[PDB]
Amino acid sequence: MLSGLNHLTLAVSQLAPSVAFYQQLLGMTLHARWDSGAYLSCGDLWLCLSLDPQRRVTPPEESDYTHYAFSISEADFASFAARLEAAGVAVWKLNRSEGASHYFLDPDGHKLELHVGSLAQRLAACREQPYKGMVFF
Amino acid sequence: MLSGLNHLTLAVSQLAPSVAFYQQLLGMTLHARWDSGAYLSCGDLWLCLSLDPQRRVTPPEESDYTHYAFSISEADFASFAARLEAAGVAVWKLNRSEGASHYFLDPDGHKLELHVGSLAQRLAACREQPYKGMVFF
Ligand SMILES: [C][C]N([C][C])[C][C]OC1=[C][C]=C([N+5](=O)=O)[C]=[C]1
Ligand SMILES: [Mn+2]
Ligand SMILES: [Mn+2]
């Protein structure tokens, strides 16, 4: 039986700017680095950056909707979004759902998000206003 | 600050087979489904499957090393991997370069992994058998 997410691994084209982005800009903890990757943590999240010459720097119009959302408190959201904006980090979508969300790109075009709110919060909102065809279990 | 992964969203090309894969085959908990997506959990992980006409079924040689690992116990690991094998689930990697792992593909070619062990355990193992150039902080 699966018990959770063990780790998220992102392929990166250049290790140094990716470490700078996740450690310095986003504030994650760097635990180890080797010639072809790094391990960081963000709360319970184990993040691995893996240097991969197959990784393309990918415009957001050229990738699908797969994305990785990080939790932040409502109180911290606006100042963290402003930090990303000051650093020139590109946005790939505007928020139109419940709970604050900021949709931003990593140096290789990985689709990231800051989100405030749990699954339980989302399900409660959906129960009140269900999406088209929605069924609950 | 950022506190962990809020959710993982995977773009899928065909919703029903993807829900079946994550719920029936992998045993995750299905909370809701609608015409364009589904919400599941795996322990604390919030997984969204999002129907996306842009998603392509992607062979593993055509994608980079970005991948998503799920935690499983030492006692359950081998029989779960063998069950996926016997079910015909495609694979993408054989060499255990980061400990006890089974590497398999979802219906759209998302790169998945079963892994036994925490980040702390992997750092301890790496101190003995470090990756080339490895530094610990
Ligand atoms: C997407 C539009 N349609 C399928 C092509 C109808 C939705 O189809 C189902 C919804 C829920 C369940 N269900 O909960 O098992 C089974 C089928
Ligand atoms: Mn999202
Ligand atoms: Mn892995």
Coordinates of C-alpha atoms and ligand atoms in Angstrom, one line a residue:
Chain A
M1 CA 0.0 0.0 0.0
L2 CA 1.2 3.4 -0.9
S3 CA 1.5 5.8 2.0
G4 CA 2.3 9.2 0.4
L5 CA 4.6 11.0 -1.9
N6 CA 8.2 9.9 -1.3
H7 CA 9.9 12.4 -3.4
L8 CA 9.5 14.7 -6.4
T9 CA 12.4 14.7 -8.9
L10 CA 12.8 17.6 -11.4
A11 CA 15.1 17.2 -14.4
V12 CA 17.1 20.4 -14.8
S13 CA 19.3 21.7 -17.6
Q14 CA 21.8 23.6 -15.4
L15 CA 22.3 22.6 -11.8
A16 CA 23.6 25.9 -10.4
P17 CA 20.7 28.2 -11.4
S18 CA 18.2 25.5 -10.3
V19 CA 19.8 25.2 -6.9
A20 CA 19.8 29.0 -6.6
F21 CA 16.1 29.1 -7.5
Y22 CA 14.9 26.4 -5.1
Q23 CA 17.3 27.1 -2.2
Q24 CA 17.8 30.9 -2.3
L25 CA 14.7 32.3 -4.0
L26 CA 12.2 29.7 -2.8
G27 CA 13.8 29.1 0.6
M28 CA 14.1 25.3 0.5
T29 CA 16.7 23.6 2.6
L30 CA 19.7 22.2 0.6
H31 CA 20.9 18.9 2.2
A32 CA 23.3 17.6 -0.4
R33 CA 24.7 18.3 -3.8
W34 CA 26.8 16.1 -6.2
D35 CA 28.1 16.6 -9.7
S36 CA 24.7 15.7 -11.3
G37 CA 22.1 16.7 -8.8
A38 CA 20.9 18.0 -5.4
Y39 CA 18.6 17.0 -2.5
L40 CA 16.4 19.7 -0.9
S41 CA 13.5 19.7 1.5
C42 CA 10.5 21.9 1.8
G43 CA 8.5 20.8 4.9
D44 CA 7.8 17.1 4.4
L45 CA 8.7 17.3 0.6
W46 CA 11.9 15.6 -0.5
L47 CA 12.8 17.4 -3.7
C48 CA 15.6 16.0 -6.0
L49 CA 17.1 18.2 -8.8
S50 CA 18.6 15.9 -11.4
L51 CA 21.0 17.3 -14.0
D52 CA 19.7 15.9 -17.3
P53 CA 20.9 16.9 -20.8
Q54 CA 17.5 15.8 -22.1
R55 CA 15.8 18.6 -20.2
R56 CA 14.6 21.4 -22.6
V57 CA 13.9 24.9 -21.4
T58 CA 10.3 24.6 -22.2
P59 CA 7.9 27.5 -22.9
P60 CA 4.6 27.1 -21.0
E61 CA 2.6 27.0 -24.3
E62 CA 4.6 23.9 -25.2
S63 CA 4.0 21.9 -22.0
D64 CA 0.8 20.3 -20.7
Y65 CA -0.9 21.2 -17.4
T66 CA 1.1 18.9 -15.2
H67 CA 2.3 21.1 -12.3
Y68 CA 3.6 21.1 -8.7
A69 CA 1.9 23.3 -6.1
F70 CA 3.6 24.3 -2.8
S71 CA 1.8 25.2 0.3
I72 CA 2.0 28.6 1.9
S73 CA -0.1 30.4 4.4
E74 CA -2.6 33.1 3.4
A75 CA -0.7 35.5 5.5
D76 CA 2.6 34.9 3.7
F77 CA 1.2 34.5 0.1
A78 CA 1.3 38.1 -1.1
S79 CA 4.8 38.9 0.0
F80 CA 6.1 35.6 -1.5
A81 CA 4.4 36.4 -4.8
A82 CA 5.9 39.8 -4.7
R83 CA 9.4 38.3 -4.2
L84 CA 8.9 36.1 -7.2
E85 CA 7.8 39.1 -9.2
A86 CA 10.8 41.2 -8.1
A87 CA 13.0 38.3 -9.3
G88 CA 11.3 38.4 -12.7
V89 CA 9.9 35.0 -12.4
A90 CA 7.3 34.4 -15.2
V91 CA 3.6 33.6 -14.5
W92 CA 1.9 31.0 -16.7
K93 CA -1.7 31.3 -15.6
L94 CA -4.0 33.6 -13.6
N95 CA -6.0 32.3 -10.6
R96 CA -9.7 31.6 -11.2
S97 CA -10.3 28.9 -8.6
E98 CA -10.9 28.8 -4.8
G99 CA -8.0 29.5 -2.6
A100 CA -5.2 31.9 -3.4
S101 CA -2.9 30.6 -6.2
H102 CA 0.2 32.0 -7.9
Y103 CA 1.3 30.1 -11.0
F104 CA 5.0 30.5 -11.8
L105 CA 7.7 28.9 -13.9
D106 CA 11.1 27.5 -12.8
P107 CA 14.2 28.1 -14.8
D108 CA 13.5 25.1 -17.1
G109 CA 9.8 25.9 -17.5
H110 CA 8.6 23.5 -14.8
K111 CA 5.1 24.6 -13.9
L112 CA 4.9 25.6 -10.3
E113 CA 2.2 27.0 -8.1
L114 CA 1.8 28.6 -4.6
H115 CA -1.5 27.5 -3.2
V116 CA -3.4 28.2 0.0
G117 CA -5.9 25.6 1.0
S118 CA -6.2 21.8 1.5
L119 CA -8.0 19.0 -0.4
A120 CA -10.7 19.1 2.3
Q121 CA -11.2 22.9 1.6
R122 CA -11.5 22.2 -2.1
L123 CA -13.9 19.4 -1.6
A124 CA -16.1 21.5 0.6
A125 CA -16.3 24.3 -2.0
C126 CA -17.0 21.7 -4.7
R127 CA -19.8 20.2 -2.7
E128 CA -21.5 23.6 -2.6
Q129 CA -20.8 24.3 -6.3
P130 CA -20.0 21.1 -8.1
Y131 CA -18.0 21.1 -11.3
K132 CA -19.8 19.8 -14.4
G133 CA -20.4 16.1 -14.0
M134 CA -19.1 15.9 -10.5
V135 CA -19.6 12.9 -8.4
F136 CA -18.3 12.4 -4.8
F137 CA -17.2 9.1 -3.2
Chain B
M1 CA 7.5 30.4 3.8
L2 CA 6.9 27.3 1.7
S3 CA 5.8 24.4 3.8
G4 CA 5.7 21.3 1.4
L5 CA 3.8 20.0 -1.6
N6 CA 0.2 21.2 -1.6
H7 CA -0.8 19.0 -4.5
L8 CA 0.5 17.2 -7.6
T9 CA -1.5 17.7 -10.8
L10 CA -1.0 15.3 -13.6
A11 CA -2.3 16.1 -17.1
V12 CA -4.0 13.1 -18.6
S13 CA -5.2 12.3 -22.1
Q14 CA -8.1 10.0 -21.1
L15 CA -9.7 10.5 -17.7
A16 CA -11.3 7.1 -17.1
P17 CA -8.2 4.9 -17.6
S18 CA -6.1 7.3 -15.6
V19 CA -8.6 7.2 -12.7
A20 CA -8.6 3.5 -12.9
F21 CA -4.8 3.3 -12.8
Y22 CA -4.4 5.5 -9.7
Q23 CA -7.5 4.2 -7.8
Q24 CA -7.8 0.6 -8.9
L25 CA -4.2 -0.4 -9.7
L26 CA -2.3 1.8 -7.3
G27 CA -4.9 1.8 -4.5
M28 CA -5.2 5.5 -4.0
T29 CA -8.4 7.0 -2.5
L30 CA -10.8 8.5 -5.1
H31 CA -12.6 11.5 -3.5
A32 CA -14.4 13.0 -6.5
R33 CA -14.4 12.9 -10.3
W34 CA -16.0 15.2 -12.8
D35 CA -16.0 15.5 -16.6
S36 CA -12.5 17.0 -16.8
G37 CA -10.7 15.7 -13.7
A38 CA -10.5 13.8 -10.5
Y39 CA -9.2 14.3 -7.0
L40 CA -7.4 11.5 -5.2
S41 CA -5.3 11.1 -2.1
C42 CA -2.4 8.9 -1.2
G43 CA -1.7 9.3 2.5
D44 CA -1.3 13.1 2.9
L45 CA -0.7 13.6 -0.9
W46 CA -3.4 15.4 -2.8
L47 CA -3.3 14.1 -6.4
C48 CA -5.3 15.8 -9.1
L49 CA -5.8 14.3 -12.5
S50 CA -6.6 16.9 -15.1
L51 CA -8.0 16.1 -18.5
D52 CA -5.8 18.0 -20.9
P53 CA -6.1 17.7 -24.7
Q54 CA -2.5 18.8 -24.9
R55 CA -1.3 15.7 -23.0
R56 CA 0.5 13.2 -25.2
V57 CA 1.2 9.6 -24.4
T58 CA 4.9 9.8 -24.1
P59 CA 7.5 7.0 -24.4
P60 CA 10.1 7.1 -21.7
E61 CA 12.9 7.7 -24.1
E62 CA 11.2 10.9 -25.2
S63 CA 10.8 12.5 -21.7
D64 CA 13.4 13.7 -19.3
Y65 CA 14.1 12.3 -15.8
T66 CA 11.3 14.2 -14.0
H67 CA 9.4 11.7 -11.9
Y68 CA 7.1 11.1 -9.0
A69 CA 7.9 8.6 -6.3
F70 CA 5.4 7.1 -3.9
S71 CA 6.3 5.7 -0.5
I72 CA 5.8 2.0 0.4
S73 CA 7.0 -0.1 3.2
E74 CA 9.8 -2.6 3.0
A75 CA 7.3 -5.4 3.7
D76 CA 5.0 -4.4 0.8
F77 CA 7.5 -3.3 -1.8
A78 CA 8.3 -6.4 -3.7
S79 CA 4.8 -7.9 -4.0
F80 CA 3.4 -4.5 -5.1
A81 CA 6.1 -4.2 -7.8
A82 CA 5.5 -7.8 -8.9
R83 CA 1.8 -7.2 -9.2
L84 CA 2.4 -4.2 -11.4
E85 CA 4.7 -6.3 -13.5
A86 CA 2.2 -9.1 -13.8
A87 CA -0.4 -6.5 -14.8
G88 CA 1.7 -5.4 -17.7
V89 CA 2.6 -2.0 -16.4
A90 CA 5.5 -0.6 -18.5
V91 CA 8.8 0.4 -17.0
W92 CA 11.3 3.0 -17.6
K93 CA 14.3 2.2 -15.5
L94 CA 16.0 -0.9 -14.0
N95 CA 19.2 0.2 -12.3
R96 CA 18.7 1.0 -8.5
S97 CA 20.8 4.2 -8.4
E98 CA 18.9 5.7 -5.4
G99 CA 18.1 2.7 -3.2
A100 CA 15.1 0.3 -3.3
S101 CA 13.0 1.5 -6.1
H102 CA 10.7 0.2 -8.9
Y103 CA 10.3 2.5 -11.9
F104 CA 7.0 2.3 -13.8
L105 CA 4.9 4.3 -16.2
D106 CA 1.3 5.6 -16.0
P107 CA -1.0 5.3 -19.1
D108 CA 0.3 8.7 -20.4
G109 CA 3.9 7.9 -19.7
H110 CA 4.2 9.9 -16.5
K111 CA 7.3 8.5 -14.8
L112 CA 6.4 7.0 -11.5
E113 CA 8.4 5.1 -8.8
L114 CA 7.8 3.0 -5.7
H115 CA 10.5 3.8 -3.2
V116 CA 11.3 2.4 0.3
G117 CA 13.0 4.9 2.6
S118 CA 13.1 8.6 3.7
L119 CA 15.5 11.4 2.7
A120 CA 17.3 10.9 6.0
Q121 CA 17.8 7.2 5.1
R122 CA 19.0 8.1 1.6
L123 CA 21.5 10.6 3.0
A124 CA 22.9 8.0 5.4
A125 CA 23.2 5.5 2.6
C126 CA 24.9 8.1 0.4
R127 CA 27.5 8.8 3.1
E128 CA 28.7 5.2 2.6
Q129 CA 28.2 5.0 -1.2
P130 CA 28.1 8.6 -2.3
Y131 CA 27.3 9.9 -5.7
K132 CA 30.3 11.4 -7.5
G133 CA 31.3 14.7 -6.1
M134 CA 28.8 14.6 -3.3
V135 CA 28.8 17.2 -0.5
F136 CA 26.6 17.1 2.6
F137 CA 25.3 20.2 4.3
Ligands
LIG1 C1 -16.7 12.3 -19.1 C2 -18.2 12.0 -19.6 N1 -18.6 10.6 -19.4 C3 -17.6 9.6 -19.7 C4 -17.0 9.6 -21.1 C5 -19.5 10.4 -18.3 C6 -18.8 10.3 -17.0 O1 -18.5 8.9 -16.7 C7 -18.4 8.4 -15.4 C8 -18.4 9.2 -14.3 C9 -18.2 8.6 -13.1 C10 -18.0 7.3 -13.0 N2 -17.8 6.7 -11.7 O2 -17.9 7.4 -10.7 O3 -17.5 5.5 -11.6 C11 -18.0 6.5 -14.1 C12 -18.2 7.1 -15.4
MN2 MN -3.0 23.5 -9.0
MN3 MN 13.4 8.7 -7.7

